[PDB]
Design a protein around this motif. Structure first.
Motif, PDB file in Angstrom:
ATOM      1  N   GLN A  24       0.821  -1.205   0.000  1.00 57.89           N
ATOM      2  CA  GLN A  24       0.000   0.000   0.000  1.00 57.89           C
ATOM      3  C   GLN A  24       0.858   1.260   0.000  1.00 57.89           C
ATOM      4  O   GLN A  24       0.561   2.218  -0.720  1.00 57.89           O
ATOM      5  N   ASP A  25       1.933   1.281   0.794  1.00 57.67           N
ATOM      6  CA  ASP A  25       2.785   2.466   0.842  1.00 57.67           C
ATOM      7  C   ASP A  25       3.524   2.677  -0.470  1.00 57.67           C
ATOM      8  O   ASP A  25       3.640   3.812  -0.950  1.00 57.67           O
ATOM      9  N   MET A  26       4.050   1.604  -1.060  1.00 57.63           N
ATOM     10  CA  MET A  26       4.760   1.757  -2.319  1.00 57.63           C
ATOM     11  C   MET A  26       3.788   2.137  -3.431  1.00 57.63           C
ATOM     12  O   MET A  26       4.134   2.913  -4.327  1.00 57.63           O
ATOM     13  N   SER A  27       2.549   1.638  -3.363  1.00 58.03           N
ATOM     14  CA  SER A  27       1.527   2.061  -4.313  1.00 58.03           C
ATOM     15  C   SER A  27       1.161   3.524  -4.108  1.00 58.03           C
ATOM     16  O   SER A  27       0.828   4.225  -5.066  1.00 58.03           O
ATOM     17  N   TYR A  30       3.801   5.417  -5.705  1.00 57.55           N
ATOM     18  CA  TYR A  30       3.555   5.309  -7.135  1.00 57.55           C
ATOM     19  C   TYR A  30       2.472   6.266  -7.600  1.00 57.55           C
ATOM     20  O   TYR A  30       2.653   6.963  -8.597  1.00 57.55           O
ATOM     21  N   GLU A  31       1.339   6.306  -6.901  1.00 56.37           N
ATOM     22  CA  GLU A  31       0.253   7.193  -7.298  1.00 56.37           C
ATOM     23  C   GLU A  31       0.675   8.650  -7.189  1.00 56.37           C
ATOM     24  O   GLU A  31       0.348   9.468  -8.056  1.00 56.37           O
ATOM     25  N   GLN A  32       1.423   8.989  -6.136  1.00 55.24           N
ATOM     26  CA  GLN A  32       1.892  10.359  -5.959  1.00 55.24           C
ATOM     27  C   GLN A  32       2.795  10.783  -7.112  1.00 55.24           C
ATOM     28  O   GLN A  32       2.551  11.805  -7.766  1.00 55.24           O
ATOM     29  N   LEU A  37       4.321  13.067 -12.569  1.00 57.48           N
ATOM     30  CA  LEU A  37       4.742  12.924 -13.960  1.00 57.48           C
ATOM     31  C   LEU A  37       3.607  13.254 -14.918  1.00 57.48           C
ATOM     32  O   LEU A  37       3.828  13.880 -15.961  1.00 57.48           O
ATOM     33  N   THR A  38       2.385  12.823 -14.592  1.00 51.21           N
ATOM     34  CA  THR A  38       1.235  13.159 -15.420  1.00 51.21           C
ATOM     35  C   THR A  38       1.011  14.663 -15.451  1.00 51.21           C
ATOM     36  O   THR A  38       0.704  15.226 -16.503  1.00 51.21           O
ATOM     37  N   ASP A  39       1.169  15.330 -14.307  1.00 57.96           N
ATOM     38  CA  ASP A  39       1.044  16.781 -14.269  1.00 57.96           C
ATOM     39  C   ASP A  39       2.132  17.448 -15.096  1.00 57.96           C
ATOM     40  O   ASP A  39       1.865  18.420 -15.805  1.00 57.96           O
TER      41      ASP A  39
ATOM     42  N   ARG B  28       8.170  -3.922 -10.642  1.00 62.61           N
ATOM     43  CA  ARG B  28       8.577  -3.969 -12.044  1.00 62.61           C
ATOM     44  C   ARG B  28       7.715  -3.048 -12.897  1.00 62.61           C
ATOM     45  O   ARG B  28       8.237  -2.262 -13.699  1.00 62.61           O
ATOM     46  N   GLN B  29       6.390  -3.139 -12.735  1.00 63.71           N
ATOM     47  CA  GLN B  29       5.471  -2.262 -13.456  1.00 63.71           C
ATOM     48  C   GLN B  29       5.784  -0.803 -13.177  1.00 63.71           C
ATOM     49  O   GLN B  29       5.787   0.037 -14.090  1.00 63.71           O
ATOM     50  N   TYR B  30       6.047  -0.487 -11.911  1.00 69.04           N
ATOM     51  CA  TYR B  30       6.310   0.886 -11.522  1.00 69.04           C
ATOM     52  C   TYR B  30       7.577   1.399 -12.182  1.00 69.04           C
ATOM     53  O   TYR B  30       7.557   2.462 -12.801  1.00 69.04           O
ATOM     54  N   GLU B  31       8.677   0.643 -12.076  1.00 69.13           N
ATOM     55  CA  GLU B  31       9.938   1.014 -12.718  1.00 69.13           C
ATOM     56  C   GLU B  31       9.754   1.238 -14.213  1.00 69.13           C
ATOM     57  O   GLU B  31      10.239   2.240 -14.770  1.00 69.13           O
ATOM     58  N   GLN B  32       9.033   0.326 -14.868  1.00 71.64           N
ATOM     59  CA  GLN B  32       8.741   0.472 -16.285  1.00 71.64           C
ATOM     60  C   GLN B  32       8.036   1.785 -16.582  1.00 71.64           C
ATOM     61  O   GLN B  32       8.478   2.534 -17.465  1.00 71.64           O
TER      62      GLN B  32
END
Lengths: 41, 41
Positions: A24-27, A30-32, A37-39, B28-32
């Motif tokens: 959950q924390d790594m996700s 990732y979302e942050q 990057l999307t912004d 892996r998905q995140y790094e990609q």
């Protein structure tokens, strides 16, 4: 045997719950940064 | 009582296995996508 199983179940449950929290924390990281990057794009 | 705790131990072991493999795959998905989004940027 029962006490051994209680100890092993406690250890496995703690490890699995820590893995839930890790995922959950790594996700969340990732979302942050995905928002970042999307912004930027 | 013994069967319930054995079931919980098996469930916790499978949960840890699936979450560890999930952790590898999601990393892996995140790094990609980090590399991909940085290239797009």
């Amino acid at each position: 045997v029962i006490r051994q199983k209680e100890k092993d179940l406690v250890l496995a449950a703690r490890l699995g719950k820590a893995l839930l929290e890790r995922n959950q924390d790594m996700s969340r990281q990732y979302e942050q940064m995905h928002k970042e990057l999307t912004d930027k794009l």
